[PDB]
Amino acid sequence: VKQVFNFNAGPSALPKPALERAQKELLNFNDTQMSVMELSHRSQSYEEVHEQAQNLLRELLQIPNDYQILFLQGGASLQFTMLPMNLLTKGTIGNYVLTGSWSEKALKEAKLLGETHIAASTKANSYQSIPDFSEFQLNENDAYLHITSNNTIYGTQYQNFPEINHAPLIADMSSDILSRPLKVNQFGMIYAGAQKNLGPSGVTVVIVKKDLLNTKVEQVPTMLQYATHIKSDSLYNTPPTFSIYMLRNVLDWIKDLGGAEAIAKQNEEKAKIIYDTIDESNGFYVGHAEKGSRSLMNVTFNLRNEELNQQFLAKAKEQGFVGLNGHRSVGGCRASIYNAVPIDACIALRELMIQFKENA
Amino acid sequence: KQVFNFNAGPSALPKPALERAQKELLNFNDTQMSVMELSHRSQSYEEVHEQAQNLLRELLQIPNDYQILFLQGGASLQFTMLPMNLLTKGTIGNYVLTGSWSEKALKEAKLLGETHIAASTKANSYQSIPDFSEFQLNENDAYLHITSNNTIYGTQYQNFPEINHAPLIADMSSDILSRPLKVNQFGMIYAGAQKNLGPSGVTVVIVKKDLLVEQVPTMLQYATHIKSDSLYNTPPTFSIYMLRNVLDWIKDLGGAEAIAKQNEEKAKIIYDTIDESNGFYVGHAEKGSRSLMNVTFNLRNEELNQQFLAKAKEQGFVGLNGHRSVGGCRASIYNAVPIDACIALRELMIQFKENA
Ligand SMILES: *Cc1c(COP(=O)(O)O)cnc(C)c1O
Ligand SMILES: *Cc1c(COP(=O)(O)O)cnc(C)c1O
Ligand SMILES: [Cl-]
Ligand SMILES: [Cl-]
Ligand SMILES: [Cl-]
Ligand SMILES: [Cl-]
Ligand SMILES: [Mg+2]
Ligand SMILES: [Mg+2]
Ligand SMILES: [Mg+2]
Ligand SMILES: [Mg+2]
Known part of the structure; x- marks a missing residue:
């Protein structure tokens, strides 16, 4: 029919071959005569998919072996609270660099849970730029430093990332993850809702330094502990299997190009x-x-x-x-x-x- | 090529719902985009979102003073979200234990507040539902929680207790919309979709509105989602689309x-x-x-x-x-x-x- 040009901001365009592939096998995946949506996440057919999505990510971003890849529900928005829930402990500070509205939403959730700081901000000039790293006000008791790599609403983006050695660097990369090479070891944790640059809504990719967060945090609900999901390889409860499958298919496409x-x-x-x-x-x-x-x-x-x-x-x-x-x-x-x-x-x-x- | 799908979660889905999904996977509603490629703030998505709610309302005859939420995190996140919202100081999260899923819900409540066991058939390895006349209830109960269908043990409530001192709350993950329900018996009902309603990735929460908050994270307040009609952040749009499709099949039969x-x-x-x-x-x-x-x-x-x-x-x-x-x-x-x-x-x- 007529032309359609898909500039949606989230969820967004998918690569056609990932969709054509899903369509062709929607009723009979891997010769099981079941949809991938109808499989047990304990089935070998599903586990293959789950593991492949992880391995493609690892290869594509060259993630180090001391990092684990989590597939979580809840969107980036849930990560805004899960992160300070796990790392913002008493006497410590959630230090944020504000470069748009999504940075402010992250900050707000940490404020509910602990001491926060603003390392730098371009809010005064309406978030038209990324502040200079030399302007970063850092604290010895920072639990982490949090940034937003791509400021989806304002159209600005980090060209490169700060060298941080006093606290883990954390980044919300929802709208630019895997749009370019990344030195993953600059970070303690990276998270991204998949629906902007990695596939469908319904799964959130969290790349985490295992030793920063593979330990039980007293008083945190089981589902809200990173430790839970690290230990269970994101299979603690039922995962979003079709979303992870589509994410796999999209990652295959990125690799293919x-x-x-x-x-x-x-x-x-x-x-x-x-x-x-x-x-x-x-x-x-x-x-x-x-x-x-x-x-x-x-x-x-x-x-x-x-x-x-x-x-x-x-x-x-x-x-x-x-x-x-x-x-x-x-x-x-x-x-x-x-x-x-x-x-x-x-x-x-x-x-x-x-x-x-x-x-x- | 004979296959019989007795999977316990995620599970078989209606062939017509999957065939419909297949057919329009690349071009939803003449938009020339997948439903997966639509903005959740688009009218195109918003109609699907609302249609899924409407079909549940019709099919379960959910009264107007209940809201229907579509959340992420599974029934497991509900295990903690519920006491997070309702288990206020000086109140008690009261549980009826009829299997291991009951146990998992009660465990999360113990993190956040005082709990109690109203009744339990654990001693007899959960071979039955306890007699309602046996329940031990408290004036200060925040809620009474039950598991309507005990997925691992194969037992199920035949009917539900008449509770008026506190809201009755039910984990209906493995039997929601498998039979008619009197929704007015409950203050809240919740279920991962992946057993009776759709694929995994969305959780259906039916909540008495006026029933349900300083210091709870925004995403974990029911009020956030009630207020935003489960569009506060990006919902699991394909899972809700598939839920709609499954509900259309149930309506059709x-x-x-x-x-x-x-x-x-x-x-x-x-x-x-x-x-x-x-x-x-x-x-x-x-x-x-x-x-x-x-x-x-x-x-x-x-x-x-x-x-x-x-x-x-x-x-x-x-x-x-x-x-x-x-x-x-x-x-x-x-x-x-x-x-x-x-x-x-x-x-x-x-x-x-x-x-x-
Ligand atoms: C879209 C967006 C979010 C919100 O993600 P949800 O999955 O909707 O919670 C958070 N951060 C950034 C940078 C985004 O672009
Ligand atoms: C499957 C099931 C759950 C777990 O659901 P998730 O979506 O995996 O969290 C909880 N309660 C009951 C009764 C179930 O059958
Ligand atoms: Cl922004
Ligand atoms: Cl946005
Ligand atoms: Cl059970
Ligand atoms: Cl089970
Ligand atoms: Mg072209
Ligand atoms: Mg390839
Ligand atoms: Mg007979
Ligand atoms: Mg019909």
């Missing part, structure tokens, strides 16, 4: 198509982020006034574009260009943007 | 009374087989407490047990091994397990008995 290094090349190219369009628009489109902090995953911009914003977005929607409205809290536009968004969608958006501009 | 007729016939096939076997097969549950959802039984010794389960597997039956904690055999016959599978099981049981 050349891994993190190759997908970064693709992601830089797609992003360049949109940012050049903005930058050659003589101010008709204005990007929110400062240039040194531009996200490769979420491109945020405004037209010169709200009327033009609305006309632009209405025209896009009429032309088949999905998900371009900015987050409700900030307005404007947001082109989400995660791994699986195809480059011809980006080209299409550029065409839209140039004709709207020329015809305005 | 005639609803909760119709599925109960099917389920009672399925259980009748297996229990009759056991009762007519002259002690060759022995059911664990007392007759009066027999589950319609999980049929537990053993052969006369461990070696016959093992020979049977081996023969079953060779013949295409999946999931019949009993829980590791109790051994024996367990035939899980949740909603989507077809009558033909139970007939096949019967015929295998009879042939095995003849050939021993």
Whole structure:
């Protein structure tokens, strides 16, 4: 039929082959004559999937052997409280770097549970940049330092990560995990809801340094202890089997295209198509982020006034574009260009943007 | 290529629901996207989300003063979320123990507050549901918690107690919407979807609104989810889509009374087989407490047990091994397990008995 261009911000576009693969075997997976959705998570067919998703992640991000990969329910939002519940012990501080709204939501949950600090923040200037690491106020009794690698709503992104040796570095990488190579040993823990760049909603990937968190925390509910899930290899209770399966399929696709290094090349190219369009628009489109902090995953911009914003977005929607409205809290536009968004969608958006501009 | 899916969780699903999912997996509702590729704030998703709630409301006849929540974390997270929200200081989390899942719920409550055992059949290895007249209740109970169907032991409440001093709370993971319910008997009902309602990944929580909070993490307050209609953060959108599909199938076959007729016939096939076997097969549950959802039984010794389960597997039956904690055999016959599978099981049981 007509064209559809999927710029949704979360859940988001999946790579077609992962979906075609799921569709073909939806009723009979691995010759069992059952859907993967109908299997015991103790079945060898399921365990193969569970283990393969872990091994693909390990290989793709080169995760060290002293790290474990968890598949948890509850979204990144649940990690906002689980993290301080496990690590923010009395006399210690949950130190946060604020670079957008998701950083503020993380902070808020730690505030419920312990002493918090703000290491650095760009909130005053509306989160248009990542602060300089030299501005980080660190504390000797920090339980961890928490960052948001990609600020989904504001369109900014860490170009690199701080060297932290006094506390574990923790990162919410929900909207840019496995969009590029990563030095995992810079971190104590990384977490990401899968639905932005790794597959479906319903599972959350948590990469954890085993010895930071494989120990029982007195007074913490069993399901909310990392230890529980580490010990049981994320099979303590019933996992989200179809979500993990789809995550596997998406990881296979990333591997098939050349891994993190190759997908970064693709992601830089797609992003360049949109940012050049903005930058050659003589101010008709204005990007929110400062240039040194531009996200490769979420491109945020405004037209010169709200009327033009609305006309632009209405025209896009009429032309088949999905998900371009900015987050409700900030307005404007947001082109989400995660791994699986195809480059011809980006080209299409550029065409839209140039004709709207020329015809305005 | 014969396969009979007696898996205990996750479990068989209705073929029409899976076929419908397959057909539109790449192009949901003419959007040219998978349901999996939609924003949860899209109208496209929001209609599915609401349709799943509406079908449960219709099928269980849930009154307006109850809200239906779709949460992540399984029934296991509910074990702690419930006392986290309702087990206030100076109140008691009161539990009726009718199996190991009862035990797991009570354990989580003991972390957070005072607990109590209203009644228990543990001493007799959970062969039955206790008589309601035996319950020991307290003025300051925060709730009374029961497990409606004891998945590992094969027993099930025939009816529910009339409790007015405190909300009645029920873990209905393995029998929700397998029969009509009087939802007004309860302050809260919860169930992982993965036995009777859908695939794993979503938990259905039916809660008396006015029933349910300083210092509880945002994600762990029922009020968060009630207030946001289970759209506070990203829900498990494909699992809720599949839940909708399963609910459409239940509606299409005639609803909760119709599925109960099917389920009672399925259980009748297996229990009759056991009762007519002259002690060759022995059911664990007392007759009066027999589950319609999980049929537990053993052969006369461990070696016959093992020979049977081996023969079953060779013949295409999946999931019949009993829980590791109790051994024996367990035939899980949740909603989507077809009558033909139970007939096949019967015929295998009879042939095995003849050939021993
Ligand atoms: C989407 C988002 C979240 C929220 O994840 P849920 O799975 O919806 O809890 C948290 N952090 C970031 C950076 C996000 O982009
Ligand atoms: C399966 C089951 C559970 C566990 O559910 P999860 O989703 O695995 O947490 C809890 N209670 C009962 C009665 C069950 O049958
Ligand atoms: Cl943000
Ligand atoms: Cl977002
Ligand atoms: Cl049980
Ligand atoms: Cl069980
Ligand atoms: Mg490959
Ligand atoms: Mg194309
Ligand atoms: Mg219908
Ligand atoms: Mg008879």
